[PDB]
Amino acid sequence: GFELDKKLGRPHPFIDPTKKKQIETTLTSDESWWNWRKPEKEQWSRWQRRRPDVETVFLKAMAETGQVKLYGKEPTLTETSLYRARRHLFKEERLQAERERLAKEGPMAFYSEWVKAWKRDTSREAVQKHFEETGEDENTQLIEMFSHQTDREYRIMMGTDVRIKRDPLAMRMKEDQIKQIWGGDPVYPTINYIQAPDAVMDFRGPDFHEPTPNMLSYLKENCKVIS
Amino acid sequence: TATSISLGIDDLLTIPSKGWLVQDAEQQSLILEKHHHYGNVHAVEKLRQSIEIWYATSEYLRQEMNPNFRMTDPFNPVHMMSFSGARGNASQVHQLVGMRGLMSDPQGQMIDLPIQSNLREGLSLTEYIISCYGARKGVVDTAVRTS
């Protein structure tokens, strides 16, 4: 357990739970000065919620997958800073795992994730059977499979580009996890901001002043200038 | 060009302990205002406390800004743009990732309301008006530094 995970760098508490002590009993607000007393009622702060960020979402995803383990369910700010310091190593581990999976399964099985219209069996044994029965080798079958891929699916698959190398954790991350990067839906609805790109401004709307009268016509209307 | 350093919204890194320190300063300012209303402290004691507690908080964020960049995000674009000596100093980065601190009215005195938000978070309407005090000084002091 401890004293070995700490040596090897495996996930472990910063403070050993066995070598841990409580902080005894402190002042009870009856033996304390007025300026050091806890308020009777909790005070609204506007800082009472923890700020959302990328680190929290990625740490929660990695704790779900078991790559790292945290002290509790929600990563702390210390853990968030540590992840920000060491975040490239875990992404490299995920990328290497994806490369190993590609090498093991084969191109047909690996890239069929982004070709949903392909219903044939994509295992290496099935590919070899198809080659023996039809004479179409693995490359021909691969070209045939990519002929059913859509442009949306192809653009999603570009995260596997050897030059892009998108994080596999981010590629498979779901919308509910992604929204927590910025904290979810804004309380003020965006529909108030949205305007059509071809919209023509209605100058008789509720947000406009009354139509500006012609100055000469306004003077003549009030009977100030004769014809 | 090959590295192509850039600047995003999440690259502007506030230190992890700002929310802890802002809440602490808010709790002490709430307690003193109640006891000032009770008549347990006088006006100068309240005026000094708000100025100095928020100046100490603002200056502590600036000190910890660099070790936070050096230990947790050494290749952060904001850090590299200033730590290398290229463009920008620690004071201007503090205006972006820490807090703008305290301003001053034209007749020397400091305003008894801190700007506890940085430019990434977005100044409130009250804070933006207060920050215009220093904007006016810079343009006016330019017209006398040259002449």
Partner: peptide, 29 residues
Amino acid sequence: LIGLYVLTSGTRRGICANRYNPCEPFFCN
């Protein structure tokens, strides 16, 4: 200056290079 700083900023070292405690090519010229 930024280009030179990035060029001469060396390897990631220590815990920023390996996830675990460790218990590179050689070029002629």
